Amino acid sequence: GAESHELQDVLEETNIPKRLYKALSLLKKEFELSKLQQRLGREVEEKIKQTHRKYLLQEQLKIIKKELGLEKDDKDAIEEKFRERLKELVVPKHVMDVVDEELSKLGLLDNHSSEFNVTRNYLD
Amino acid sequence: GAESHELQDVLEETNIPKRLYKALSLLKKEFELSKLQQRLGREVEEKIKQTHRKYLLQEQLKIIKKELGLEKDDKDAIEEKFRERLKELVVPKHVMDVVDEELSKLGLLDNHSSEFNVTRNYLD
Amino acid sequence: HLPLIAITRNPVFPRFIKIIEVKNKKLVELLRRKVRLAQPYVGVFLKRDDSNESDVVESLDEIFHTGTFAQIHEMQDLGDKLRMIVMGHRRVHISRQLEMVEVENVVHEDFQVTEEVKALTAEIVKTIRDIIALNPLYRESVLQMMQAGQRVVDNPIYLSDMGAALTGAESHELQDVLEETNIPKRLYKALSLLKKEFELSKLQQRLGREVEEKIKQTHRKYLLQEQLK
Numbered sequence A, B: 001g002a003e004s005h006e007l008q009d010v011l012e013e014t015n016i017p018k019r020l021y022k023a024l025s026l027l028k029k030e031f032e033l034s035k036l037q038q039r040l041g042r043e044v045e046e047k048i049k050q051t052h053r054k055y056l057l058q059e060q061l062k063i064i065k066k067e068l069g070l071e072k073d074d075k076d077a078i079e080e081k082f083r084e085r086l087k088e089l090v091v092p093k094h095v096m097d098v099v100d101e102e103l104s105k106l107g108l109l110d111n112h113s114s115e116f117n118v119t120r121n122y123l124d
Numbered sequence C: 001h002l003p004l005i006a007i008t009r010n011p012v013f014p015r016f017i018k019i020i021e022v023k024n025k026k027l028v029e030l031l032r033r034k035v036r037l038a039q040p041y042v043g044v045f046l047k048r049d050d051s052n053e054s055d056v057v058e059s060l061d062e063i064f065h066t067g068t069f070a071q072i073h074e075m076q077d078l079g080d081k082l083r084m085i086v087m088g089h090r091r092v093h094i095s096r097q098l099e100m101v102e103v104e105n106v107v108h109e110d111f112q113v114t115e116e117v118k119a120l121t122a123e124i125v126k127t128i129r130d131i132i133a134l135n136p137l138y139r140e141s142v143l144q145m146m147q148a149g150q151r152v153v154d155n156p157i158y159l160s161d162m163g164a165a166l167t168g169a170e171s172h173e174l175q176d177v178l179e180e181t182n183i184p185k186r187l188y189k190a191l192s193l194l195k196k197e198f199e200l201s202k203l204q205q206r207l208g209r210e211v212e213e214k215i216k217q218t219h220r221k222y223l224l225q226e227q228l229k
Helices: A004-012 A016-049 A053-065 A078-087 A093-108 A116-124 B002-014 B016-065 B078-085 B094-106 B114-123 C026-033 C053-058 C119-133 C139-147 C155-163 C171-179 C185-229
Strands: C018-020 C045-047 C061-072 C084-086 C091-094
Touching: A004 A016, A016 C185, A053 C185, A078 A093, A078 A116, A093 A116, A093 B016, B002 B016, B016 C185, B078 B094, B078 B114, B094 B114, C045 C171, C061 C171, C119 C139, C119 C155, C119 C185, C155 C185, C171 C185
Parallel strands: none
Antiparallel strands: C018 C084, C045 C061, C061 C091
16 A cells, blocks of 8 residues: 555665565555554444443344334334233233234234234224 | 237228328237236236245344243243143043144144134133 | 524534424524524534433533534425524534634644545545445445545545444444544544444344345245155
8 A cells, every 4th residue: 555656766776675675664564554553443443342232232122113114104003003002901911912922923924814804803 | 919800900991191000009009008917017026025025024023022022922832831731730641642632733733723723722 | 692403313414414303493483583694504513412302401511512513505394394404514613612702623634745645535435335335325426426536525524524424323423533633533433433333234134134044045945845745
């Protein structure tokens, strides 16, 4: 990555050993600069890695939220809509685990299936 | 691709502009029918690809459920839940083989199938 | 002498058009007051950690002393009554926002010998190209319009600022980059932040593409089963 001026200076050298030594010195200087840059980059890497992995987990969670939201249409939020509807319900354990099985199947299934439609009506 | 009746009608036409108009006519009619066919084919292919990608996003949704809500559930599955429920009973063997066959069917039976619900109720 | 603009999670990178839409209508009166002014202007700043709307009106120290003065372009108000357009024109750092007095303390120091300084620019642009290719965020037409070899880059600092603006780094990281006064420090910090944000985003997309690979693998195994079946 030496300069054009450095290349001109290398060319100005006449003797083979002298130009070879100048090229080796330029190699050493460029390598030293690259190592300093890489070490500073690595130090900055650890510095920003001090950011807790909780941030990465939260970003994964947000991505999970930011998935087929349909511009907050509230449609296709069927699972969430039912969960909020059940939120205000002091409800037994049998219906909740049955509903868990059923909506797990719902997620497993595709939207337009007829069996999916029957399950949707039953969940209603 | 016009039918032979259209070709005979064109042949009946004598004026050169008229038969040229009819040739352009059949050309557009074929163009429209084709364009509709290719648009329909590409739409169906895109829908199938989106169905595959919806299986993809459903598996991603399963990863989402994992450790959360439904998929969180409890360690027990229907299989193991009924195994432990029946663990504390001094029980005969014919019922053990019947339960083993029922559990094998349950595993083979998809959870959504009505036969699966019948099997689950019988096992309960 | 104007009240601080409520950023409300609308970061404004240097030399980047951004839209601020604050639900509160109080800013509407301020915007309508400055219309009679021959040269309307808006203050652009950055909020500190733990954003709180009440604190924005209770205390003025929450907003970073750093700001980006700019010229207002035009009202739209298409869907909302507040569609403020904020652009990165003139970076400024107020000594004490409590006490307005302002000075254009823009530090752009550079060395007289300029033959290796632009090499890191080549590395930066190559890295930016790699990130956008592997992590598409914006159209490539901007890169074609702004080519390092075109020689039209009269503001290398602003070019680096935009390239770092592609980074998805938290506003804390952007503030850290801004605090840096030395050009090499800010450039290296921006490069490192860019590669971290690329790491995060590529993990995000790798999860789904790995789902793709898993389902294809199971289908292929079932297809061999199906041949023998």
